[PDB]
């Protein structure tokens, strides 16, 4: 197994997986690494999986059928998922913590949204449908744009966001389009 934790790539207090190199710190892991379980596989590993189990879930969908699914444990299982590939991106630690907003000709955002916020809610099964998770995902973003306006600082959201967005047509296997 890899010597390092795959979201944050830093060495500490490492569970590693069965089934593949990877290794993770606890709360690193969406969902935090089980307590028990011997074997354990990654959510990597389990993402595997179900696209081996439907080799047609692979098949191209349209965005507005996946948004309208239901968070049965497949659909729980790929947010956690999309949710841990934004993580895994360094530039993820300007949106992870709860935000405030006092800046010279700007208002803060109506409604505030941060990644600890979106992970705490999939704990808490609080999304019926995968629409709840990617609209909470795509405010984050939003909420930086509109607020940072003409500063630098603005393009740290287009980053992320795109790494958001390129995992979402993976990871739900999105019909592509020029
Ligand atoms: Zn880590
Ligand atoms: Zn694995
Ligand atoms: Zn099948």
Known sequence: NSNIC???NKWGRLFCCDTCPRSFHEHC?????????????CIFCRIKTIQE???????????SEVLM???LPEEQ???????????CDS?????????????????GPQKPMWL???????????YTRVEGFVQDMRLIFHN????????????????????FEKNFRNIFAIQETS
């Open 6 to 8: 795959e979201v944050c």
């Open 29 to 41: 892991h969406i969902p935090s690494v089980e307590a028990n379980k011997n074997p354990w596989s």
């Open 53 to 63: 189990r439907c080799p047609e879930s692979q098949s191209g969908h349209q965005e």
């Open 69 to 71: 699914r239901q968070m």
């Open 77 to 87: 299982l790929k947010c956690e998922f999309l949710l841990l590939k934004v993580y």
């Open 91 to 107: 530039k993820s630690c300007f949106f992870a913590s709860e935000p405030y907003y006092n800046r010279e000709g700007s208002q």
């Open 116 to 126: 600890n916020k979106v992970k705490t809610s999939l704990n808490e099964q609080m």
């Open 144 to 163: 930086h744009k509109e607020f940072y306006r003409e500063d630098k600082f603005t393009r740290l959201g287009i980053q992320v966001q795109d790494i």
